[PDB]
Design a protein around this ligand. Structure first.
Ligand SMILES: [Cu+2]
Length: 97
């Protein structure tokens, strides 16, 4: 699954926003336009076993085209989002199976 941070004409959103995946798939985030972006996991809706400090990204990023990877493996749901662009409504969610 590939996600693009930022719209293709003027909009800050996680595109796609929410989507399910198989417990063994790779999730690569990609900067499409609107950097710098940020990704963190709310330790309030994350399973009580998958630490959110390892899948989060406390390190901002301002590289055009830069990308990151994440591979969850616990059938459930994880809520992530952007702290800087949280004023617009930039959020993220993944339902693993
Ligand atoms: Cu952002």
């Amino acid at each position: 699954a590939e996600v693009k941070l930022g719209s293709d004409d003027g909009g800050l959103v996680f595109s796609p926003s929410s989507f399910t995946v198989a417990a063994g798939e790779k999730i690569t985030f990609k900067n499409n336009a609107g950097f710098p972006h940020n990704i963190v996991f709310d330790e309030d809706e994350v399973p009580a076993g998958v630490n959110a400090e390892k899948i989060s990204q406390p390190e901002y990023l301002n590289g055009a085209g830069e990308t990151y990877e994440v591979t969850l493996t616990e059938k459930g749901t994880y809520k992530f989002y952007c702290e800087p662009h949280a004023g617009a409504g930039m959020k993220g969610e993944v339902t693993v199976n």
